[model samples]
Target: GPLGSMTNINFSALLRGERMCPLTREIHSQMLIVTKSYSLVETFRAFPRLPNILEIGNNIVSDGNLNWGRILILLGISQLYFTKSESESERTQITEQLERFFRQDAISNWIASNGGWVTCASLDL
Candidate 1:
């Protein structure tokens, strides 16, 4: 039970609403500048590869004490990507992709083991 009771958490909904904690919101804003020049077409090309980037980031950060940074970045990037969606269907597709990313065993297990989304609220921005 890697996810424990957090298995039922709806990340897509959390991301869509204000349910994402303050620290997450801050970091997500920072990432906006990081990707400010990223066009919609670029986001579209890079969207599917985001999970791999997160996996690599996870590996990089896992060597240290705080392994949750990458997940926060993932959240930020997902939010940014969502804004690039022009149509309702595109937004829905992006939302589903985000949910799928969290459902990945490595990503979800890391999140659950690291104190779940609650930890994101307390993380350094």
Candidate 2:
């Protein structure tokens, strides 16, 4: 109570990895990245182990942490569906999914706070 209500907890810096968290980095490295819709589906169909897109999405959102890893994973998955779909409704759903993750205060702040990195090799997504 000596500092009298410090205003600067600086979650932005903490989440930015100004203070490193090696384990966070490690699991983040393991996430998937696919370009074409075919491979996106197929890779998960048979990966380092059998994968489930829906299952993965559930975990990432419910797990309640924000970082480039979860952000890109969500982006990649939405891009896969967005590229594959033909219907307006399908596009709408995917758009909201992207917004919900990337546009949120915590996620967006982290990106802006760090000046954003190109986590994906290609910007095509």
Candidate 3:
């Protein structure tokens, strides 16, 4: 419900039968589970239970197309975990979570299929 800052191109699109992405799938799925308490606090509280929620972290960037969505997903997930980390244990957990998510067969395939070339200076992927 707090996604008001973003465009309305979300669950509404899914309602219309559009296939946004693997990431979108998880958001749609969570909406169903968190329907009872879909408030902002509830959404945050549900984060731990919703393993696929970080897929939201994969949401697109302005350079999504140019980078074949590589750096977008990288930056997205990084921001997600980076901010989620508060204490040392949480940081360790976030690290493991990142590694696990990246190791997914589907995620690995998507990265390979994108065929990107990320550079450091401009990060011109």
Candidate 4:
């Protein structure tokens, strides 16, 4: 959960979907992931067997079949990684994870192939 104070701003549609990069192609099928703190923390808490966050950095992965991400990183997701020096390492990690994760997630690949644009910082086909 992001600071509740900002929830109002997000509902305006700015931080709602992409959660950043208000201007980008994203699958609005679900709410923002990292913004929902428990989701992010659960990655380390419950899914430790999953890919290493150190390698992925939590930049977020596309959740749909759009392939636009292969071309550019989603701007919104990328912005979160720029926060601090300690956070920097995680940013790189998530960037790398997003890179590898997208390759196999066929939905994301097909979306890009169909002319999708990796609308957010989580961009990667």
Candidate 5:
């Protein structure tokens, strides 16, 4: 933990992946960057998965564990009602779904801990 200094970087990017999850993709991208550079003693902490963000470093919860349940919900919502070229209604529905997920306590807690910062965007479940 003391071998290397810790640094934080902040920025945002648009998603170009098939997923309509711009935030998720961006977050996951950063997580990868952190992981690839992780040293044996470097404690890498981040949202295990975006959309269904999980609170890491919690004693009761496993750190770095991916939360796919919420992520799946997000993926479904995105697929059924989202696109860079979809109807307004479709886009609106996607947003509403996302808002609901964000409002959920289980979800919000993770999000709050995750600092609204997306980590892994891919739904691996």
Candidate 6:
């Protein structure tokens, strides 16, 4: 049954401190060191076709294909940014940005169709 595999899958919980993929944690830790020398914008500029946090959903899906690698990278970057933010305003803004990205139809549809956030647990860097 569809519901059988869907058990305990919650994107919000996964994104909002309930759980995080080990790969993402590793990426986030790496980004922490990278960001110390390079700003977020500089780091983002190094990636091809990567959009800013607020614009992630726009470039995520192209020609009916989902860029899962890019999605994972964005998640890691956002997590790093959120962790290193010194101001509450920046943290709140980053949270909202992630929420919006996860709410995008294409992004949410992919998550649902791919066994939800649990699929992230199997990802490797």
Best by TM-score: 6
TM-score to true structure, per model? 0.54, 0.44, 0.36, 0.32, 0.35, 0.56
- Pairwise TM-score winner, candidates 1 and 6: 6
* Model 3 CA deviation exceeding 4 Å by range: 1-74, 80-84, 116-125
lDDT of 6 by residue, 84-107 (tens): 567777767776777777777777
lDDT score, candidate 2, position 66: 57
Candidate maximizing lDDT: 6
| Candidate 4: C-alpha lDDT | 0.36
- The CA lDDT of each predicted structure is 0.55, 0.46, 0.41, 0.36, 0.38, 0.56
Q: Candidate 4, which segments miss by more than 4 Å at Cα? A: 1-20, 23-29, 33-44, 49-87, 104-108, 113-125
Q: Which should have the higher lDDT, number 4 or number 5?
A: 5
Task: Please identify which of the two predictions, 1 or 3, would achieve the higher lDDT against the true structure.
Answer: 1
Winner by lDDT between candidate 2 and candidate 1:
1
Superposed Cα deviation of residue 25, candidate 6 (Å): 7.6
Model 1: how far is 111 from its true place, Å? Answer: 1.1
Q: lDDT rank, highest first? A: 6, 1, 2, 3, 5, 4
Candidate 6: global Cα-lDDT? 0.56
> How accurate locally is residue 69 in candidate 2, as Cα lDDT from 0 to 100?
50
How many residue pairs clash per model? 0, 0, 0, 28, 3, 0
Model 1: per-residue lDDT, tens digit, 21-124?
A: 56555545544444454442455464564334335344445655445555555555666566555677766766666666567677667777887666655555
Candidate 5's clash total is: 3
lDDT (Cα, 0-100) at 52 in candidate 2 = 41
RMSD per model, one decimal: 6.2, 12.7, 15.9, 12.7, 14.0, 6.8
User: Candidates 3 and 6: which is better by lDDT?
Assistant: 6
lDDT for predicted candidate 5 compared with the true structure: 0.38
